[PDB]
């Protein structure tokens, strides 16, 4: 009955491959095989490993409602995030979606409880933008990226929440100036605002030395040369 | 900076776990956009980055791109993913060759010392689709002996079996008493509708291992029907096709 290591090894190898139906089955078996014999965050992730693995399996089979139901009493922010995302995926993120208010509320309660997991901060940041609360969206998205600096989707929503060169200059002065992503952001943002100057080209060159054969950076260079030319 | 690397890896791992596929794809592209008995795991380490990328494309349903990414990769995981990406891309285009190229690639690999189970699985699947049942059983049988908890291979095996004879035969070649051999026999018998005494015996034996397993619970309902709410549900869902 400690054989269930074989279920884990299967779940791992099949998810890697991505044999989703094989995983789903293995997860279902894994859960419901008897009682099994921030620091606090990872500890809850260990407690919910099996329950998460299951929900994610349902999620990868597009069985979203079931994925959310699976993690209904789960306290880890990974589980909470997945639950909330799965919920949204029934019927990117919009006000007309049936689950949207519910998400909002769940995220509000979590903020008053002093949660600041980046992916939930991200979610918060997204929802506030959609509700035309730009200055609050920036607040949450800024926090997110400080904690999760290589999480591109948060930088994009951040750029979308910024509507002036002032508001931009402000935010940029609150991010790690030396950090590679702060630079990659400033090039993206400056372009999307069309307030492209010397420093943007300077920073893009600095990024290209790190990522010489990146399609994204190549597309940015094209976009900068085109803005300057008008 | 080789820390930028590690932060991209931590992102890829956390975002994949969270279902954020587009975030992963980006991170992977960046990651591969910087300068640089069994030995299988050693090749997996070599191709970690190239794999991570292809899998990102694969999770965005960008199958052809995923396959092209791993074209020169030698690990059976990469090979499998490559060939599987092709199959799936092939199967969407249905609405046939392509299975041919896969077939051939799998043949050459089998003469070469290779019999990785997930490739055997792939072989097994492709032969069934080409109406070669007796050959599909051969490969799927090998697979499950090596990879006994890999459900998708047992299901394709059951699908490749069309008589109680062909079933009884195959079952006599699997570790009788191995757990999954029992779970299989219950599924297969039901899916062929020749259910007997022993099926109920074996299901009870499985249920003491997995007392709250949704799948086993569905099987029990399906057997108790066979002996003569869940029936209300979709047969495709209950047989785990879907």
Numbering used by the authors:
A (entry chain A): 21 to 57, 77 to 130, 147 to 285
B (entry chain B): 20 to 55, 77 to 135, 152 to 284, 295 to 308
Copy text verbatim from the article accompanying this structure deposition.
The Cdc23Nterm subunit has 282 residues, with six cysteines and five methionines (one S atom per 25 residues), and is thus comparable in size and sulfur content to the lysosomal protein from mouse solved using S-SAD by Lakomek et al.. The sequence identity of Cdc23Nterm to other proteins is below 30%, making difficult to find models in the PDB for molecular replacement. In this paper, we report the structure solution of Cdc23Nterm achieved at P13 using a S-SAD experiment at λ = 2.69 Å (4.6 keV) and the related methods and we discuss the instrumentation.
A variable micrometre-size beam allowed the collection of sulfur data from separate regions of a crystal, which would otherwise be discarded, thus overcoming crystal imperfections owing to the presence of two differently oriented twin domains. The long wavelength enhanced the Bijvoet ratio to 2.21% (1.0% at 7 keV), thus increasing the anomalous signal to a level where it was possible to determine the sulfur substructure accurately even with moderate data multiplicity. The quality of the calculated phases allowed the autotracing of 384 of the final 472 rebuilt residues (81%) at 3.1 Å resolution. The Cα r.m.s. deviations, calculated with LSQKAB for 219 residues, between this structure and that reported by Zhang et al. are 0.80 and 0.92 Å for chain A and chain B, respectively.
